[PDB]
Scaffold this active site. Structure first.
Site, short mmCIF file in Angstrom:
data_model
loop_
_atom_site.label_atom_id
_atom_site.label_comp_id
_atom_site.label_asym_id
_atom_site.label_seq_id
_atom_site.Cartn_x
_atom_site.Cartn_y
_atom_site.Cartn_z
N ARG A 35 0.69 -1.27 0.00
CA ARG A 35 -0.05 -0.09 0.09
C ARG A 35 0.77 1.20 -0.13
NH1 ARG A 35 -5.29 -1.84 1.51
NH2 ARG A 35 -5.28 -1.27 3.71
N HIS A 44 -5.86 -4.20 -9.87
CA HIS A 44 -5.82 -3.58 -8.48
C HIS A 44 -7.40 -3.69 -7.78
CE1 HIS A 44 -4.03 -0.75 -5.79
NE2 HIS A 44 -5.04 -0.17 -5.43
N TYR A 86 -16.56 13.30 -14.83
CA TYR A 86 -16.25 14.57 -15.37
C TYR A 86 -14.95 14.57 -16.17
CZ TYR A 86 -20.57 16.08 -12.88
OH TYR A 86 -21.58 16.27 -12.50
#
Ligand SMILES: [Mg+2]
Ligand SMILES: [Mg+2]
Lengths: 471, 214, 471, 217
Positions: C26, C72, C116
């Site tokens: 991580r 992932h 967006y």
DNA sequence: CGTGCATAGTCATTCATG
DNA sequence: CATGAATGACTATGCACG
């Protein structure tokens, strides 16, 4: 600079735009493939990405992102949620997506987030797409002008009636009950032969809705009205058994087993009716709901009135035909579906015939070369460029253009196989195919017959018993 | 919560109403903070023409940040309230909804000439040396395509950049605005009540008789 | 069946698993490409999907879905948010993603939702990937065993120091200041020649952090400590100008212009300091913050203490080397990066050399055929199958296996070009390439020299003036 | 809110604690509603070993639905509280966190033998005729892959919501074929010592614990 | 009220560290 | 209380209609 507009006029344009898009592009199903656009874009995109029933499953979120990116400029959730409905056996009759994991249920529990689930297109789903790749249907650009999208699907079966659809837009809303694929097609075929068909006879084939949740449907009179006009009201009663106790093993479509149960027990605690004595014991493979003075018939009969163990289902059959909202009955829906399949069939053939004619002309060419082979190679060797090569063949043995690329690009082991018999075989094959096709293309009865066959071949494969019963 | 301008001057300062935070970002970024203030709404707005109302955060905030009040009274607080929505069709619906709110309640505001609609691009098309155009709806596109390409479509304001939003649709020198005035009241009421109204029976007929489904 | 485990032991396993994954997989950057895995997976996936700086932009959400689906197994948001950081010029020094639309800013405003925005990989980003496709770096399987993923990137430049990185895991956390790509590489090169290098000299090249937000950095002493040990404290002061008024045109890294301003004005209203008189007027192209008794020096000097106009920045340089947490200084980071580039270089060459040798052996083959051509074709014709064809060549002219496929699959226009001169040209070319390569592969100085060149060629292209200043 | 079993019997009814709604769905679906109740938590759980506590909805609910209380007192309410988390590593962290809550507060519950950990598959591998295996961590995988040789398909449950009803039951809930872990404590001293390092608040030692004990191979 | 597509948001928690 | 990757969720709106 500023343009001065009124309130009345501005309100007009702005509403008129939205009203339209909402009706066509969002809510209302096409009368031909009986699909709203999200649905269509999900199927097309999935299948394009070959995510099919036969091959492995694919992380829904990837699926969603690809749709959003290529075809569908909207929320992830809007798309994925729709994708999930299509994976819902109690909602859709013949399911067009298979999902692995938690996709809600009849208790209403919410589907697992997309990052969890995995999905693929179902089997019958492919039939909606079938022959897509053969220019059978009008394509448009996507929002970005980056790639082309189908405006409707080929539609091997009459999806609209089969899986029903609902249904909310400006000025118009729709609800269409699912139907028995087998029965639907029966009707379709009959109309194909006797187009001037009256509903009463069509009814003999499509007798009324088939709900995926079984249940009992009562109201032949109003049903006909629905099939005639496009609007109707029907009664739906859960299927009841008496054990020595009330056993419930089917409930009405679009109804929420979970709350339905609480509403029943609320009857007991409110002691609103007599003998009220209510448990839910249903597990992965079967629906079961369990309910002194065995005024049983009063309890049951009351339940029907005062709760949703028996509801009515409403017909508002509204689809898009000719780019516009129409409320229609079985006859319009069927007829239009049929006429569609016609264009599809003819377009398919037209494309196939051309594909044929090209390899035929090319084959015809190779055949000639097999006889001049020694000299042909000799020419190619004496030739300067690949192109000079081609151009010399066109000049000498006056082959065509396409024939040239073909002979030239031929690899070499292909010379290992000089044997006009095989080519001739293929040629015979092509000629047979072409002349057969040209028939469908200009033989109108020959065409409708192929429509009949394909429809039967489908009815057979995906046929399934009735699940809902009629009283 | 709002992103107000530096100077507090009700004579030349504008209020920019936006469809949400994401869009609002680009708004705040490409903007002359001297006299341009920016207020986001959470998506579609309560149909004011259909107590439920004043209790809706989104309406209540608009009222407060503007001054005046619902009754009304005027000069607070800006000599322009400009409605800037996504360039797509959902944008037009929000325009529709916001306007009927103003027309219904803030009427004088509207009658005055203080409600504006801002007209930001939907499509941008491009061919060291670059040629670029802007289109506002499907019609516009065809001629643009014939002229030119890469086509970009703003699925929302947050998708264009700061330079663009300013240069195209905020900077008063080169921008163009719409000013909403009412030339009947009768006609206005009649129309708003059908479209935005609550009856539907007529709305449908209005579509049927007036929406060219070509 | 039930296994009986203690609390102590269960708590052990379970924590030990998480502690590990968190540290490596991580939070903590690899010391070689200075990347956390999300980052790596975003770059790799994007580039694999060829989403590069030169070609058009691509709907972030598609990008995110593909990463999630292939590489992932996590939240969309985790991935996309990270993707967005990489598009943040005030956060990263040399940006590895370009995004179009609202991606937040220094005022802290939040990035526009993924549906967006649109994104691509930047230019320098490619250099991180460069030579990937030539088996230069260890691959593993993805979670699904469906496709292979790189465990680290080639890393044409020393990303780790360049773009810094932070930094929170179990037991370990990290903060590494961005650095001046030019300066970093200078150091790298020097170490390559004089490996036994002392920090003091390295400092002459890499003198200390370069922040993307400019600013003033003071604390050479502590900086050295940071570069030596891996931990340090530095002072960062916004860059101040006096107008006749206090003009602020740079603030400290990782600091929030918006709140920073409110905190300043809070000083005025709280009238905590004397002459307090505060406006923010910054627009798309420049940072500007504006601030009787012109006790100006007192006001400014107070501001530094009591607010974040001047903060300290902390060094905790912790990366993953050898699959494990290490707190390291410039010397470890540089050395390890260098050694990496070595493996990469050697692996690159090894793969290139083989690629060469194959086409060389195949070319050598075609050359021979050009001389036997007439007879060769004759053989192919007299041959039965494609395979029979091959097998007959192997039997007669004892060509090899691969040579056979090559001669056979040859198209036909290729015969148009029988000209041993050209083939010979290519052969000369190959032989030169191979013998050159074999050098790098067994010439250790020759190898390090190529490392030097490539590094310089990079320093040139992506070089940029300092932005932060040192006092 | 919880999805409780039909019969209310603290002698043989189990409480299944889950990592969230999505997972909870599959839980509720594949399950014997006679004596299996299901309670979702919103992701990672407050580190109880680090007033802040009782005010946290997620902890407060657990307490209420179980009976007893924080003090404690016992027999309410189920003779098994089973912790069922995603099979990945974040799951182990939540297991870690939940346990220190029980150990810290509900101690007797733990001391008793009423805290269980459920061990659901992470990987499922497959080659009319089908061959299928289950793996629980990376190690397990290699042998499974070697076994299945070519043609295999490997599926990895990125969370419980990703397997189906039939699976979750057949593998990890049905008592006939399931296997559970029972958490008991055999010191108190050792327990406290350990929990305080790992879950504790000091860090200085946690690090050393990793350094000396986490095999980064 | 919910139904199905859309508009647009928000919250809790971990972990180290100043 | 941020900071950066993670765990896991929620809320308001339009629209027709019973
Ligand atoms: Mg919008
Ligand atoms: Mg999980």
């Amino acid at each position: 600079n500023i343009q001065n507009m009124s309130l009345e006029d501005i309100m007009g344009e702005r509403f008129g735009r939205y009203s339209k898009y909402i009706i066509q592009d969002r809510a209302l199903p096409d009368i031909r493939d009986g699909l709203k656009p999200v649905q269509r874009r999900i199927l097309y995109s999935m299948n394009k990405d070959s995510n099919t029933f036969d091959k492995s499953y694919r992380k829904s979120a990837k699926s969603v992102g690809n749709i959003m990116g290529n075809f569908h400029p909207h929320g992830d959730s809007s798309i994925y949620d729709a994708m999930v409905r299509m994976s819902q056996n109690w909602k859709n009759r013949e399911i067009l997506v298979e999902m692995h994991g938690n996709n809600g249920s009849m208790d209403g529990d919410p589907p697992a987030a997309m990052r969890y689930t995995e999905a693929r297109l179902s089997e019958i789903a492919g039939y909606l797409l079938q022959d897509i790749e053969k220019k059978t249907v009008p394509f448009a650009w996507n929002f970005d002008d980056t790639e082309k999208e189908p405006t409707v699907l080929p539609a091997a079966f009459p999806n609209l009636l089969v899986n029903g659809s609902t249904g909310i837009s400006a000025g118009y809303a729709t609800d269409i009950p699912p139907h028995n694929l087998a029965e639907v097609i029966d009707a379709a075929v009959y109309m194909i032969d006797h187009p001037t068909a009256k509903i009463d006879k069509l009814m003999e084939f499509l007798p009324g809705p088939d709900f995926p949740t079984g249940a009992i449907i009562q109201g032949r009179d109003e049903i006909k009205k629905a099939y005639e006009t496009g609007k109707g009201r029907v009664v739906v009663r859960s299927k009841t058994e008496i054990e020595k106790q009330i056993v419930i093993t089917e409930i009405p479509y679009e109804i929420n087993k979970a709350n339905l149960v609480k509403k029943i027990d609320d009857v007991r605690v409110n002691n609103k009716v007599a003998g009220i004595a209510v448990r839910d014991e249903s597990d992965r493979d079967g629906l079961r709901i369990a309910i002194k003075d065995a005024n049983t018939e009063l309890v049951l009969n009351y339940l029907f009135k005062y709760t949703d163990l028996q509801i009515n289902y409403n017909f508002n059959m509204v689809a898009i035909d000719n780019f516009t909202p129409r409320q229609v009955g079985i006859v319009p829906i069927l007829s239009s579906y049929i006429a569609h399949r016609r264009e599809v069939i003819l377009a398919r053939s037209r494309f196939d015939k051309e594909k044929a004619e090209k390899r035929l002309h090319i084959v015809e060419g190779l055949i000639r070369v097999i006889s001049i082979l020694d000299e042909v190679i000799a020419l190619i060797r004496a030739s300067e460029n690949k192109a000079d090569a081609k151009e010399n063949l066109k000049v000498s043995y006056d082959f065509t253009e396409e024939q040239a690329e073909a002979i030239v690009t031929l690899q070499l082991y292909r010379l290992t196989n000089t044997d006009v018999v095989v080519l001739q075989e293929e040629e015979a094959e092509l000629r047979e195919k072409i002349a057969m096709l040209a028939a469908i293309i200009g033989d109108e009865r020959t065409m409708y017959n192929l429509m009949k066959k394909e429809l039967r071949e489908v009815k057979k494969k995906f046929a399934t018993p009735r699940l809902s019963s009629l009283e | 919560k709002l992103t107000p301008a530096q100077s507090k001057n009700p004579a030349k300062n504008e209020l920019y109403l936006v469809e949400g935070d994401s869009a609002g970002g680009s708004a705040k970024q490409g903007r002359d903070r001297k006299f341009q203030a920016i207020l986001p709404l959470r998506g579609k707005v309560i149909n004011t023409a259909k107590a439920d109302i004043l209790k809706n955060e989104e309406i209540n905030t608009m009222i407060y940040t503007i001054g005046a009040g619902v009754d009304f009274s005027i000069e607070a607080n800006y000599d322009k309230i400009i409605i800037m929505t996504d360039a797509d069709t959902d944008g037009a619906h929000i325009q529709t909804l916001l306007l009927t709110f103003f027309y219904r309640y803030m009427r004088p505001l509207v009658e005055a000439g203080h409600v504006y609609i801002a007209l930001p691009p939907l499509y941008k098309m491009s061919k060291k040396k670059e040629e670029v155009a802007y289109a506002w709806t499907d019609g516009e596109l065809e001629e643009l395509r014939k002229q030119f390409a890469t086509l970009q479509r703003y699925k929302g304001l947050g998708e264009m950049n700061a330079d663009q939003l300013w240069e195209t649709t905020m900077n008063p020198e080169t921008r163009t605005l719409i000013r909403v005035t009412i030339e009947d009241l009768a006609r206005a009421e009649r129309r708003v009540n059908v479209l935005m109204g609550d009856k539907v029976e007529p709305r449908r007929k209005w579509i049927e008789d007036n929406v060219k489904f070509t």
